[PDB]
Write a protein that binds this ligand. Structure first.
Ligand SMILES: *Cc1cc2c(cc1C)nc1c(=O)[nH]c(=O)nc-1n2C[C@H](O)[C@H](O)[C@H](O)COP(=O)(O)OP(=O)(O)OC[C@H]1O[C@@H](n2cnc3c(N)ncnc32)[C@H](O)[C@@H]1O
Ligand SMILES: C/C=C/CC/C=C/CC/C=C/CCCCCCC(=O)OC[C@H](COP(=O)(O)OCCN)OC(=O)CCCCCCC/C=C/C/C=C/CCC
Ligand code: HEM
Ligand SMILES: O=C(Nc1ccccc1)c1ccccc1C(F)(F)F
Ligand code: SF4
Ligand code: F3S
Ligand code: FES
Lengths: 239, 138, 102, 613
């Protein structure tokens, strides 16, 4: 016998004139996994099956279960429940997002912005591709460490106040870091023109180094450092 | 569908709907590096409001600066109250200056980890207090 | 394409290290020439500063243009006011010196 | 039905699934100038392919000199000779060409001193047709190869104008007179029913690992294509063959890569002695997936456990230099600490054989064409293709070799695309469908949406998961498999009793998981009945009552004066399963394994022999 309380953000689009409210659930942690998702599925399975969330891997990769737990954007399948019974876990959907239902946000814009930077290898002549493996030294490859691991959970971009006030025109850390990923990839021949896409007030320059992105990343990555590294390239690249 | 066409549909779908925005400032857990950022904007705005008031009053108010200080002297110049006025003027200026250096070190690429942000953040706070107290008495 | 955004960014940081240069320089050498330098660098850095606040918070077509025009006037008035103060009055450096030992 | 709005779509091709297989097939069709749609219940990136961590096999010869024909031998041997060699020939030849395709797309593979793709050892692979020792041909992106594979493909997929139906749940196949016309699907976003029709349909819905209580698979691995094909009356294949991966974490069941063992990792029991040295003398813990996990389960049986319950085994990593663990295996390094609280560099990981991969699936050509079984003979289902884990060209047979499914994905996704692009042209007549078509998919949706029953969707799902876990495990006997059958059959009758709570249209996750339950059940029935009928021990399927490997000949002694066993007397054949959706009865016939390759001169057939490592 060991009960923990969960306050969860709830909204039904199918119910007439229902507006957002918090609903509390109680869980015996002895009959539960260590993580928040374990509890989320537990209440979904045993208490209230009206609870709606995204999940898949229960492993910390896919990036489905991205949500605001106790004030910080992380992954429910990676974050363990605070065993402190006296405290009450507050579960919210990712900040400043259009809520489809309960904890399920509309990530369409986020995805679309990722499409706008062209996250694929680009050569000046792709007339020889699919027959030889491109050469990249161990050092040229280590530049991608800390960048490629990104899982597109959108925890960081949703922690950035710049992405709240200007989500429409500002690409956000997640997307920006991936643009940086393809910038320093030695195999990519489009390094200059990729930087040229950011030549406007909003796309990149809405970053003010608030560092909520790097602080919240459930994968331990450093998106802000990459943004600052972009800014330096933006200021130094010739022609 | 192109990326631009998708974003156009995203906004047309949501603005014309009854979907509510998830809370942001209301719910987000406040941290030192975060709190220190808004303060940089606050101090930036306050200082520009200071410079602009000081410049426009040189154009809109009669009499020279020397005579304007006699008005300050006229209302009894309290010993503690004059130090507080100097502290409250230097406090936002010194915060913004020291944090500006921290912002300029960042733009060079240096010191961009969460442990470093806490360390360098604290060092600004300590430098602000000392230089604010130090200058207010000269 | 042009480098119109990246040039503006570098400009911001340039005047910042310039303004960080002027504050100790004005104390150690308070004069007429340091008054105008501190007037130009101060109003510019401020003008670009509020511009970043305007671009972040002012939403709309008619409003974004209007606030920018409003800021352009206010900051130009601010630079004119300081230059007048340096030319026809004590000058900011000495003005700080007078205000301080009071 | 007049309560549900129906929107019809017209395309040249439909790909169901946006995993590794789906994507390669999806944009491969569009690359060939086809107006293609891709229907998927997850966002492409979220697909289970991200979880992949071992690697992708190709005989690129980056580390030692290699031949693709050696990779051929290892796959067919691994398959325990249930693997169709015509499709193994096709895949292992394409392997190098396929991996290079991915590297040129932008996949950030690890690198050698020469600067080429890094490969290393993996369980079951050898040089010189088995004679030349351990082979290093597992191409990997450090420890996150499947993640990089999925993102690179999705990255590329954006260059073409494929119409993606993101977060759309495919209900059934749009079948008409033994021909596929497309798919009917629910739009999870606004609860609307969509009829997407095309000349060719591709199914890449991945496996059904969620039929069991403990598995490395995602919550979304519910074999939804397997069920769709079943509901159409088409046969499924080899569903009793379920890959039990040796090294899954003791807690949540998460996968810890076989790459650990490929980099020098060791399996250990309570006594301290490296037990895999006794079971497999030569290859040791770098042997077949079914043989290693068999030894693990056997050590638990005999008291040699590990923890306080003595019910698991250890994977040791102390002796490996820390820098190797950081460069080669940072993925597990984090997830072993997260879930088991284990500092990889100091302590060993509590590992246990758990459900991993489904080599069974939809019967398939080497060209991707879905096969039905008429009059003891093969027959191509018109306009229906399947690839990946969802399919069964049986490249993997009775046991999948490690790092071969990510290969299977890319090779055969490409196959489906080229197999269409060279049978018809885009802008061809898109076969028309009845105004009634897909009626009982919508009518099934309606009943499950308002299902005012007595048994919860979760309670029945657990009952199914524990029943498969204890009756169809690593080892299984006749009597135990028997009890699992009428227990599973009773639970199909219990699908009539299910209670659902959410009555909403928008994002009814209560409803989609109920659809998934029907899907899992149909996958479960065919797994358990097919297993109980198979009275032999071959690959992953191991019978305690029938230890022998039953083939046409007793291949231990040389074939000469030996007499053939008739087709219906041995078990060296594919298990084909059907089920009448109403009564839930499993009927099963069979079809022979393909032993002729694509070219004998270029790749000589490998006849059955005693297989041990
Ligand atoms: C489980 C697993 C497997 C695995 C692995 C690690 C784990 C944890 N690592 C591997 C590795 O390193 N190397 C390798 O060769 N194989 C590895 N595997 C096995 C293999 O990767 C899997 O079999 C493979 O991931 C399966 O890929 P596939 O493309 O065939 O299927 P999927 O990735 O699981 O994607 C499924 C897609 O289908 C859509 N879907 C499913 N149902 C529906 C319905 N109802 N309606 C509409 N769409 C549906 C999903 O949206 C998803 O995109
Ligand atoms: C909110 C509003 C804030 C607005 C921000 C505007 C900042 C203006 C920058 C002023 C730079 C200081 C230069 C003046 C100076 O130091 O020379 C005088 C010198 C004479 O030598 P001396 O020591 O007097 O020599 C003695 C010989 N008799 O030194 C001094 O006496 C003054 C030094 C102490 C003041 C430093 C703090 C700066 C804050 C001032 C606020 C600005 C008001 C406008
Ligand atoms: C010499 C000391 C100063 C330094 C080193 C400095 C530096 C900086 C820097 C680097 C920024 C941009 C922060 C970023 O990276 O986003 C900034 C912002 C700003 N500063 Fe200063 N500054 C100084 C003094 C002042 C003064 C005296 C004023 C008053 C006019 C001022 C007004 C502003 C304003 C209005 C902003 C905009 C805040 C924003 O970015 O939204 N600064 N400062
Ligand atoms: O924008 C913020 N300040 C800021 C803007 C530009 C430059 C420096 C700080 C900020 C920083 C941290 C937390 C919250 C905020 C916000 F909510 F939006 F007020
Ligand atoms: S940078 Fe981190 S928080 Fe942002 S999308 Fe990638 S993994 Fe998620
Ligand atoms: S939270 Fe922000 S504005 Fe930049 S440093 Fe991170 S993206
Ligand atoms: S569900 Fe895969 S990241 Fe949480």
């Amino acid at each position: 016998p060991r009960i923990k309380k969960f306050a969860i953000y709830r909204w039904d689009p199918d119910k007439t004139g229902d507006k957002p409210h918090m609903q509390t659930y109680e869980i015996d942690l002895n009959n539960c996994g260590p993580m928040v998702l374990d509890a989320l599925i537990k209440i979904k399975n045993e208490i209230d099956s009206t609870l709606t969330f995204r999940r898949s891997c229960r492993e910390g990769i896919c990036g489905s279960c991205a949500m605001n737990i106790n004030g910080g954007n992380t992954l429910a399948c990676t974050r363990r429940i605070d065993t402190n019974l006296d405290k009450v876990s507050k579960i919210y959907p990712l900040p400043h997002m259009y809520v489809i239902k309960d904890l399920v946000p509309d990530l369409s814009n986020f995805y679309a912005q990722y499409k706008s930077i062209e996250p694929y290898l680009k050569k000046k002549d792709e007339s020889q591709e699919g027959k030889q493996q491109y050469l990249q030294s161990i050092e040229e490859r280590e530049k991608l460490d800390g960048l490629y691991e990104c899982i597109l959970c959108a925890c960081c971009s949703t922690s950035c106040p710049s992405y709240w006030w200007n989500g429409d025109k500002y690409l956000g850390p997640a997307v920006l870091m991936q643009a940086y990923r393809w910038m320093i990839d030695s195999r990519d021949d489009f390094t200059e023109e990729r930087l040229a896409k950011l030549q406007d007030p909003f796309s990149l320059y809405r970053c003010h180094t608030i560092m909520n992105c790097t602080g919240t990343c459930p994968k331990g990555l450093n998106p802000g450092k990459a943004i600052a590294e972009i800014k330096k390239m933006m200021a130094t690249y010739k022609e | 569908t192109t990326a631009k066409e998708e974003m156009e549909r995203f906004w047309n779908k949501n603005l014309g709907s009854n979907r509510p925005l998830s809370p942001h400032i209301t719910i987000y857990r406040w941290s030192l590096p975060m709190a220190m950022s808004i303060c940089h904007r606050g101090t930036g705005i306050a200082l520009s409001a200071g410079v602009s008031l000081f410049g426009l009053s040189a154009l809109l108010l009669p009499g020279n600066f020397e005579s304007h200080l006699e008005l300050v002297k006229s209302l009894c110049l309290g010993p503690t109250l004059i130090y507080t006025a100097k502290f409250g003027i230097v406090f936002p200026l010194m915060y913004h200056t020291w944090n500006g250096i921290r912002h300029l070190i960042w733009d060079l690429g240096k010191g961009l980890t969460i442990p470093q942000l806490t360390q360098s953040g604290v060092v600004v706070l300590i430098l602000t207090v000392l230089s604010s107290v130090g200058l207010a008495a000269m | 394409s042009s480098k119109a955004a990246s040039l503006h960014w570098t400009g911001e940081r340039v005047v910042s290290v310039l303004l960080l240069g002027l504050l100790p320089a004005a104390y150690l050498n308070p004069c007429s020439a340091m008054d105008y330098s501190l007037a130009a660098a101060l109003t510019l850095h401020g003008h670009w500063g509020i511009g970043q606040v305007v671009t972040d918070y002012v939403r709309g077509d008619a409003l974004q243009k209007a606030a920018k025009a409003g800021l352009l006037a206010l900051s130009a008035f601010t630079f004119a006011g300081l230059c007048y103060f340096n030319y026809h009055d004590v000058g900011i450096c000495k003005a700080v010196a007078m205000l301080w030992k009071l | 039905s007049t309560q549900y709005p129906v929107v019809d779509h017209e395309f040249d091709a439909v790909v169901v699934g946006a995993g590794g297989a789906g994507l390669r097939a999806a944009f491969g069709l569009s690359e060939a100038g086809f107006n293609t749609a891709c229907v998927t219940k997850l966002f492409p990136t979220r697909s289970h392919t991200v979880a992949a961590q071992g690697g992708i096999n190709a005989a690129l010869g980056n580390m030692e000199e290699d031949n693709w024909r050696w990779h051929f031998y290892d796959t067919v041997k691994g398959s325990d000779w249930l693997g169709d060699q015509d499709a193994i020939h096709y895949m292992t030849e394409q392997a190098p060409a396929s991996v290079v395709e991915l590297e040129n797309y932008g996949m950030p593979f690890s690198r050698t001193e020469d600067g080429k793709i890094y490969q290393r050892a993996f369980g079951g692979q050898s040089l010189k047709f088995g004679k030349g020792g351990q082979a290093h041909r597992c191409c990997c992106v450090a420890d996150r190869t499947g993640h990089s594979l999925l993102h690179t493909l999705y990255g590329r997929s954006l260059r073409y104008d494929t119409s993606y139906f993101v977060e759309y749940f495919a209900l059934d196949l749009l079948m008409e007179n033994g021909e596929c016309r497309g798919v009917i699907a629910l739009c999870i976003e606004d609860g609307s029913i969509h009829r997407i029709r095309a000349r060719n349909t591709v199914v890449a819905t991945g496996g059904y690992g969620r039929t069991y209580f403990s598995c490395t698979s995602a919550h979304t691995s519910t074999g939804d294509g397997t069920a769709m094909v079943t509901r159409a009356g088409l046969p499924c294949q080899d569903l009793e063959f379920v890959q039990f991966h040796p090294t899954g974490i003791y807690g949540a069941g998460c996968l810890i890569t076989e790459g650990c063992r490929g980099e020098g990792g060791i399996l250990i029991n309570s006594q301290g002695e490296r037990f895999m040295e006794r079971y497999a003398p030569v290859a040791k813990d770098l042997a077949s997936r079914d043989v290693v996990s068999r030894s693990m389960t056997l050590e638990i049986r005999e008291g040699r456990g590990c923890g306080p319950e003595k019910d698991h085994v250890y994977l040791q990593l102390h002796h490996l230099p820390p820098e190797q663990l950081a460069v080669r295996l940072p993925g597990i390094s984090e997830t072993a600490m997260i879930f088991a609280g284990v500092d990889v560099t100091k302590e060993p990981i509590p590992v246990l054989p758990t459900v991993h991969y489904n080599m069974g699936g939809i019967p398939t050509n080497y060209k991707g064409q879905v096969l039905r079984h008429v009059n003891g003979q093969d027959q191509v289902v018109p306009g229906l293709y399947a690839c990946g884990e969802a399919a069964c060209a049986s490249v993997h047979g009775a046991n999948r070799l490690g790092a071969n499914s990510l290969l299977d994905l890319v090779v055969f996704g490409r196959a489906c695309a080229l197999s269409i692009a060279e049978s018809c042209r885009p802008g061809d007549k898109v076969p028309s469908i009845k105004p009634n078509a897909g009626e009982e998919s919508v009518m099934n949706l309606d009943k499950l949406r308002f299902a005012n029953g007595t048994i919860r969707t979760s309670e029945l799902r657990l009952s199914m998961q524990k029943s498969m876990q204890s009756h169809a495990a690593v080892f299984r006997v006749g009597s135990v498999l028997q009890e699992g059958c009428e227990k599973i059959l009773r639970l199909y009758g219990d699908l009539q009793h299910l209670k659902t709570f959410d009555r909403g249209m928008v994002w009814n996750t209560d409803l989609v998981e109920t659809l998934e339950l029907q899907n899992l059940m149909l996958c479960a029935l065919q797994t358990i009945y097919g297993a109980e009928a198979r009275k032999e021990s071959r690959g992953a399927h191991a019978r305690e009552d029938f230890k022998e490997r039953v083939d046409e000949y007793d291949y231990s002694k040389p074939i000469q004066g030996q007499q053939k066993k008739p087709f219906q007397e041995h078990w060296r054949k594919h298990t084909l399963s059907y089920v009448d959706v109403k009564t839930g009865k499993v009927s099963l016939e069979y079809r022979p394994v393909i032993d002729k390759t694509l070219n004998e001169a270029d790749c000589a057939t490998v006849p059955p022999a005693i297989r041990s490592y």
